[PDB]
Amino acid sequence: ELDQLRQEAEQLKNQIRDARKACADATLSQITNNIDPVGRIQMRTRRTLRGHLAKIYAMHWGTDSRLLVSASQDGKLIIWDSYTTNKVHAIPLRSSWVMTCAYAPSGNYVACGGLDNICSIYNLKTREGNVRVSRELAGHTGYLSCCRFLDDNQIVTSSGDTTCALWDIETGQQTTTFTGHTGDVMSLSLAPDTRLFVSGACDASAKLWDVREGMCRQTFTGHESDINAICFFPNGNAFATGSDDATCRLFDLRADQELMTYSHDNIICGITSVSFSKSGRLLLAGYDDFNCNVWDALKADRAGVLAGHDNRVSCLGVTDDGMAVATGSWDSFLKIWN
Amino acid sequence: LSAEDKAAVERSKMIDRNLREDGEKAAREVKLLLLGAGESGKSTIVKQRVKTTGIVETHFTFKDLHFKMFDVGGQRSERKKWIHCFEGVTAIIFCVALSDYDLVLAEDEEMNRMHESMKLFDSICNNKWFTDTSIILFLNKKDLFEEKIKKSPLTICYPEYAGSNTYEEAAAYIQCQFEDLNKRKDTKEIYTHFTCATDTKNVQFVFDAVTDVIIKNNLKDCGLF
Amino acid sequence: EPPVILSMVILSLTFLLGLPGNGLVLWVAGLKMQRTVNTIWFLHLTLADLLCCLSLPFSLAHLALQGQWPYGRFLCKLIPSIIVLNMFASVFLLTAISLDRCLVVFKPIWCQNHRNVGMACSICGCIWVVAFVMCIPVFVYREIFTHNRCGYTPLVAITITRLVVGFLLPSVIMIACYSFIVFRMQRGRFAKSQSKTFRVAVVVVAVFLVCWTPYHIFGVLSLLTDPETPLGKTLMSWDHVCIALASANSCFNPFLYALLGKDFRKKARQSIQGILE
Amino acid sequence: IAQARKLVEQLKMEANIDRIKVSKAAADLMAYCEAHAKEDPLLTPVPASENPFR
Amino acid sequence: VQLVESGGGLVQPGGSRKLSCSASGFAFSSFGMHWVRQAPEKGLEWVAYISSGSGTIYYADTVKGRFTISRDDPKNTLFLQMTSLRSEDTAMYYCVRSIYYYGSSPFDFWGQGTTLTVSDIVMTQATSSVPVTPGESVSISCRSSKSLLHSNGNTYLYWFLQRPGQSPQLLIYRMSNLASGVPDRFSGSGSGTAFTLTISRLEAEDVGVYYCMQHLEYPLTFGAGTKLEL
Ligand SMILES: Cc1cc(C(c2ccc(Cl)cc2)c2ccc(Cl)cc2)sc1C(=O)N[C@@H](CCCN=C(N)N)C(=O)O
């Protein structure tokens, strides 16, 4: 019984590969060759957020593009006024082994998780005037890798137990479980419409899941090693992945395959974080080589470099208005680039 | 700056001061990482908050020294995914069941259990993150090993072992075998103790080793060691 | 004059070799590194050394014109006082560093529980106050006499206090602390055969003694002979070269203290490479 | 066993989606980039008067 | 959240008195505190401010040298020591909590007040009392001596409401932001030196005195007060 089903799976995978190859008409290099290059991008540091005492593991911009939250291994969640450099909130964590943090797209809640296998939701707008823990989502077997608010009451998490989970925060129960990944899920990215989301895991594959139907819509397999970072194109029809094979990749949802590879001989280290520019023309990636690279997403040539982190660049994010970039690194500093 | 801008600046300054006092308070604790292969007796060491987290933290105090001990057994992923989080601990306490060198009780080449203990020790001691972190090595179950070495020899897992089957000789052979896995003997120390479960010398030994580690860290941070 | 030209070459070499070194050490330790207890001492020592090196031009100018350069009373009372304050603050900071090292070796648990940056800042402030107190004599007694020259008054008490508190007590404290550190670490249950501690301590103490011993030897010898004696005539210029040798320690200190640490050396090399590129 | 059933069902589901040619998708990406290039404050920097950061 | 005042009464002129406020239900130490007096005949008047952490302290020009504001954080209490009290110091004294960070709402909660019996921005109310009926829309105007819009881009104008027999309650902060728990029928608008508060579909419980205050700089200045009655 097992032999027949293995053979059927082999035929199905072969037919998927054949359909993908038949769909591949022309690369995004020949039909983007007439595009003028962006040239040399020169972004300068405008702000330096000091105050974390251990390395920074995650940061997230608020939707107003002025407030941001960072998570550090000193057990602390700090909200920063990117404009004045003022720190608005300092939230102590019951577990200092934090790995992810999210900012609700209303400003009222923050989330954080890590090696405790629990996603803690903190209320930022309380009548008593201090940040208090709103809920603790428990049920993941492994550590929390990423979390993203769908809404004030819905949150999607990825964990090292090889599953993602959609949680209704009002009750503390996961409404949906997303299974199918073989390795630990490292990264998560929500579509701008929040109908779909994409996740990268240690099996070197990315999966697109329908949040409502709770099933895997598609699978993308081009990377040679673990996928640490994933990000949606602003259109919502493409996403970029960053792996530790020193390569970033671009995948189209409608074409169901990979479009472009962002790599260089001088680059040997793996990607920690990826993000797009407001129009999606530039792709920003942070590396273990202590800096970030700005790629022309259409032409796959390196447009610039954001060298400003004595340690590995662990997180990076672009504002909603596209004005500035934020990089958090293992040297305990946050830098804002214009 | 407006009045409200000034007040927000003052609030940010207050938060900064509180962060620095919290960092000073947190720097006072000696943080140790517990490690050991399957059924190595690290539970009986830690007995000498968490549901499935595998980040079990034990805080205690010995002779005015604050210890935070982190047990990471419940995490079922590869260590490469979370071991970098512990780059910066004062020491790694590695527990090895001395009396378990015949039974398999794990995936193994032909027949051993000390092989995976050696492999884990080699992977941990020789690691990018723990380049200078010291190891406190505990060799548990000395009496069961005594009777085992009386009934069975070390050869079935130590082919190069020579000398009469005695407790001290076999125990020192385990000493040497585990302590020679170090490849940077000029950078980090190994503190090895034969766990006397009938005495309180295990915690005293950890205290002495941690005191030595603290002194060495201070001295080599200023170029004196 | 061989003594005058020797003093000129000593002062110029120390200035040209210590101003960049002290500037680099201060910049790296104050703008790039985290504020640790071991960094406060280096910051204060580098500040004192930098002030001495920036005062070195004035000394070279005073030597150039065979004295006679300050035509007023205020400059004569002022510039030497500043120089002396900086030098003896540096000496006391060296003593404090040695004491701190001996304390972390001797009382590791107490240091782990009660060693923060505020205590170091308070000790450094008290050190600066004591250095100012030692400096005040120079302001009080340094007078202008008429060729013209400003010089010196209970000199005996000034010299004895300078010798005892600026040399004897710090020398004894550093020697004892470093001797205890080398042996203490040597006779431990976990003691490891090593020679880095011995050589580093010997070099530190030897450099301090070589730089600061002829100064106090000549200070004592001045208070034991008649100035008009030919021995005093010989001793006059070698006193100036002794002063230059004592001031030379401000350029040696950054290499001995700040640059010995692996973290500081790595950070300084990284910053130098980044600025050069 | 049952995992084989699950993977076979998943591969059947993933093999029945409609795919558009890569040239069309790349043209759509290029079109989106061209339509939003003039309002991206990282390709062409905005004057410092309109810069919230310095 | 509760702020309870105590210490009022009858004081002979030239004497001393101590007002104490107890706070409960919120993190007292992270809030700045204001003492605000209101005479039995006129409207509100800012008296004093102490910052979170006891840093800056501000006094009104008429109380400087006589009054002293302090706080005991472990006991969660706010103290006002007044000496040499004159006949002009008789008023109801309120304690206001006000927290300051990006996006906060200062002057959000007020205490019940205690009764005691013995350049500068000018805020002008165009009307003192207007007649209204339930179900209608009313507009209240306030004028500033100088522009309350700051270079940072926000206008430091606040609208408060005092219903008959209770302490003032925050309505609008920064000239445009609706306070928490306030019905979505009030709207603040305008520009520098000219502000309007509009109530659409008014009813009972809205009658009372509306005040406009500036927070551009100290001393904080209130308006005369516009009264809405049936
Ligand atoms: C620090 C200092 C500096 C002095 C000279 C000078 C410095 C460097 C060189 Cl190359 C040449 C000349 C100087 C004068 C004026 C100016 Cl503007 C600048 C420099 S004299 C002097 C000092 O220590 N005086 C003591 C006692 C004198 C010696 N005591 C012994 N030996 N025990 C004191 O005042 O009691």
Residue numbers in the entry:
A (entry chain B): 3 to 340
B (entry chain A): 5 to 52, 178 to 354
C (entry chain R): 20 to 165, 169 to 174, 331 to 455
D (entry chain G): 9 to 62
E (entry chain S): 2 to 119, 136 to 247
Text lifted from the article:
Anaphylatoxins C3a and C5a, generated during complement activation, exert their pro-inflammatory and chemotactic effects by activating their respective G protein-coupled receptors (GPCRs), C3aR and C5aR1. Here, we report the cryo-electron microscopy (cryo-EM) structures of C3aR in three distinct conformational states: apo, intermediate, and fully active. Structural comparison of C3aR in the apo, intermediate, and fully active states provides novel insights into the conformational landscape and activation mechanism of C3aR and defines a molecular basis explaining its high basal activity.
The structure of the JR14a-C3aR-Gi1 complex exhibits typical features of active structure of class A GPCRs, including a 5 Å outward movement of TM6 and a 5 Å inward shift of TM7 at the cytoplasmic side, compared to the apo structure (RMSD = 1.7 Å for 206 Cα atoms). The structure of the active JR14a-bound C3aR reveals that JR14a engages in highly conserved interactions with C3aR, similar to the binding of the C-terminal pentapeptide of C3a, along with JR14a-specific interactions. In the fully active structure of the JR14a-C3aR-Gi complex, JR14a binds deeper into the ligand-binding pocket compared to the intermediate state. The arginine moiety and carboxyl group of JR14a, which mimic the C-terminal Arg of C3a, form ionic interactions with D4177.35 and R3405.42, respectively. However, in the fully active structure, JR14a forms additional contacts because of its deeper binding, resulting in more extensive hydrophobic interactions—particularly with TM3 residues, such as I983.28, P993.29, I1023.32, V1033.33, and M1063.36. In the Gi-coupled active structure, M1063.36 adopts an “up” configuration, directly interacting with the methyl group of JR14a. Deeper binding of JR14a into the TMD induces substantial conformational shifts in TM3, TM6, and TM7, facilitating G protein coupling and driving the transition to a fully active state. Specifically, to avoid steric clashes between I1023.32 and the methyl group of JR14a’s 3-methylthiophene moiety, TM3 undergoes further rotational movement, along with a translational shift. This causes M1063.36 to adopt an “up” rotamer configuration, allowing interaction with the methyl group of JR14a.
